[PDB]
Amino acid sequence: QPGQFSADEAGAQLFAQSYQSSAEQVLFQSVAASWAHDTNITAENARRQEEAALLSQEFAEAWGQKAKELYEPIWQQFTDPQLRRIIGAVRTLGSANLPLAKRQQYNALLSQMSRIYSTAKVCLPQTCWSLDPDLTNILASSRSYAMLLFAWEGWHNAAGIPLKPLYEDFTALSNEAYKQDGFTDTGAYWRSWYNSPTFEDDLEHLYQQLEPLYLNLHAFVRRALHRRYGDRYINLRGPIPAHLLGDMWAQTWSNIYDMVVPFPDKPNLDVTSTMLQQGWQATHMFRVAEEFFTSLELSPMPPEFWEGSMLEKPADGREVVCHASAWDFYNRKDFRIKQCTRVTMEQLVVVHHEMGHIQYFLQYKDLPVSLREGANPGFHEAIGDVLALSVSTPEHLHKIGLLDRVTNDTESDINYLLKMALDKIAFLPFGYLVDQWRWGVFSGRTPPSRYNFDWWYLRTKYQGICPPVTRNETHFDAGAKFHVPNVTPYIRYFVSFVLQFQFHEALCKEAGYEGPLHQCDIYRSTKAGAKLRKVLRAGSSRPWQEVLKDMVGLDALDAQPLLKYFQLVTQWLQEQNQQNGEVLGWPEYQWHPPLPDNYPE
Ligand SMILES: *[C@@H]1O[C@H](CO)[C@@H](O[C@@H]2O[C@H](CO)[C@@H](O)[C@H](O)[C@H]2NC(C)=O)[C@H](O)[C@H]1NC(C)=O
Ligand SMILES: *[C@@H]1O[C@H](CO[C@@H]2O[C@@H](C)[C@@H](O)[C@@H](O)[C@@H]2O)[C@@H](O)[C@H](O)[C@H]1NC(C)=O
Ligand SMILES: [Ca+2]
Ligand SMILES: [Cl-]
Ligand SMILES: [Zn+2]
Fold first, then answer.
1. Ligand 1 atom having least distance to the Cα of 40
2. Does the CB atom of residue 600 touch ligand 2 within 6 A?
3. Structural contact between residues 386 and 507, judged by C-beta atoms closer than 8 angstroms
4. Known binder of ligand: residue 357?
5. How far is residue 80's CA from residue 67's CA, in Å, rounded to a whole number?
6. Which of 345, 375, 424, 513 has most Cβ atoms within 10 angstroms of its Cβ?
7. Which residues are near ligand 5, the ion (C-beta closer than 5 Å)?
8. Residue whose C-alpha is closest to residue 585's, from 216, 207, 203
9. Through-space distance between the first and last CA atoms of the chain, rounded to whole angstroms
10. Residue 401 — left, alpha, or beta (φ > 0 → left; ψ -120 to 50 → alpha)?
11. Ligand 2: which residue has its CA nearest to atom 12?
12. What cellular-component terms does GO give this entry?
């Protein structure tokens, strides 16, 4: 239960300490119980994950209503701006304002929407495929239009449809809750984490500068799809069917790199085989990564990291979650990683990314728990990726003894950037739109009667894609993407994509590097590390604009560092598109591809 504190700013400082102190114990339980589950999926452990979660709601309610009984009408016009937000957070009760039975209704909807997603199956005319790895693989590897069309249509129908009636009731209750906290809708509350009165306009001006890069990549890749699939399925002036980009959601188009290779005569960069020959196992891949940070004079992994982490899939027939993730137990003691690591090149990069999340934790663990977060929701993924921007370059792989010779031809530099663009450039329109759709549902502009209409309106407006089958309003294609039924903000991922290349430009300049930006490697740069150490140890204890300015010199998001990065492959794509007489964009916006002859037979 909460304590007894005064109703002024000087006593608020006391209400924080006791609150921050008790939050450790409660926060630690919620992370410890999820760990005992995600590394050992048993029903009994899943039931402990819920008890620890409900125990957190009780803590946030009790300490939130207390905060609201004391300082509610006098915390806004406060002295210390750090306290202005700490108590501002505590007073926000979200679902605790709802009546008791609805609070139950709110949670049950979260529980059912997540489960409905994980257990959605695509059964055949016979056995049934699942999202991971069955359907994911098909969408990446298969090159039969009719096949890809079956996985795409089957999954969206399976996952989307049953989620719509639940999502409506969730939106209705999510908004009732956060209005009692002073917000027009949940969206306004989400968007308030960035403290930017012109946030949505700043995001549109960002993408307006980025759109030329995607329209070029769009046409270039659309021509590649025209050769493989023909004219009956690829309109050179219309949208691209949404199942021919190697990804279920077209987020990234990296699994169709074998179709768009600028120069296939040059060898693909893949040091995976070399790693196996030198005897690298998972544990060594992390020791290598740990050394990347210590070269920057950053913190090494503490003993608890090695003791507790899960660096390999367990051998004792334990059901685990294999997706790589980094865990902060909010006790300044236990930091771990759970990853079914595999001795591959991509995994080596992933291990550095996930270790960035750790280095972040370690650097700000001396702050109050409320400030053990990134500067804004889009920082963690920006720190993990900016590191991977150095570790993925052949320059670095050569220095850690994984690439004997470093080629210098520009043709190979175009293949590297193109492979990058299929991840960093193709995702921008998607990371931008996902929350735009939710912002519309939360505000009301997108009532349940127009879930799929506004969904595909955005998908066609930004990604330049279209459904390969006809869709009406019984379908809820927005729910077929994990982050929707699981209620996970998405605009942060569009932000980190912009942020990282800002972090990269700065860290490379600080390291003294000169030359093509994509060939930069901050490895063994102690001046680059000190710059990171400033950002990482700040957490959220300062405005993210300040931190970014101290690090990058600019107090806002700027897409120019990203454009400068892809400067070479951008010009090369404009030349290819003009030699082909391409039409950037999709003027024939009403176009949809016909069904394959006698489908799905
Ligand atoms: C995975 O979770 C299960 C619980 O669902 C663990 O099984 C328990 O383990 C403790 C520790 O030895 C025993 O005292 C309990 O009797 C076990 N309960 C059941 C129902 O078997 C299991 O140990 C966990 N995995 C690992 C590797 O410890
Ligand atoms: C909505 O769609 C349902 C599924 O049928 C598929 O979509 C329609 C639009 C056609 O393209 C059809 O060839 C597809 O197989 C229909 O069963 C339903 O009647 C449609 N209309 C509604 C729900 O009002
Ligand atoms: Ca991801
Ligand atoms: Cl966010
Ligand atoms: Zn990450």
1. 1
2. no
3. yes
4. yes
5. 17
6. 375
7. 384
8. 216
9. 63
10. left
11. 470
12. endosome; external side of plasma membrane; extracellular exosome; extracellular region; extracellular space; lysosome; plasma membrane
